[PDB]
Write a protein that binds this ligand. Sequence first.
Ligand SMILES: [Zn+2]
Length: 258
Amino acid sequence: HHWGYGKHNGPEHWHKDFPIAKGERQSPVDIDTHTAKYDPSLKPLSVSYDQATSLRILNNGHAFNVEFDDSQDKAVLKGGPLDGTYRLIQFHFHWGSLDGQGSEHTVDKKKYAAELHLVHWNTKYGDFGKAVQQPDGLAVLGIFLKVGSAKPGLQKVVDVLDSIKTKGKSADFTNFDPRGLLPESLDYWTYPGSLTTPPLLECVTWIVLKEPISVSSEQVLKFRKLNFNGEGEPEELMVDNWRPAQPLKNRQIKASFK
Ligand SMILES: [Zn+2]
């Protein structure tokens, strides 16, 4: 039936409806730190989120998205391995049922408790829908979350989850500053990949930050209280909405640091 993360519709079944799942530039991957090539020609990332305008938070049945106004160049990513300007459209997370799993990318096979994805689209394409059809249409910043100390800047998010518990619910979510979600260092790994959920288009330049941010156990617990199901349907907790690492195939992972 429709795709999800259960036994009968999970990642291992996606290829039936989305043949691109067994493609040549599928994401996530395992980051082998000894095989990643330091590339001194890569520029530092430029994150200009001071004018970010968030609008809403939504439970789409597979995660929760915080959406931003992308009608102008207010929150953009540029530099790094990118050419042009990429506008932030939304951010979301992938998490697990336990603290030992949840991230999509792994580092030397280490899994983190969750992974944040900031999704950006290449402004030369005019809109998000056109951008997904191009090899350089999107740039996704990925940030790992480890459990330790609470992240103050994440609390506003945590607090509104009760109101979007089931699929299709949404809530006004204005004046949220995504700068509160960044690690101190912007060192990163980069590779050409895809979206990690259907339709799995190979249109992403991945930018994975080396430094994880910490969240408290209690903050992550609140994530695990969301539901995959819609209101009045049997309860299925929203946990383990992560795709396992895919084959690197013909790709090189580059590092911005040594
Ligand atoms: Zn994602």
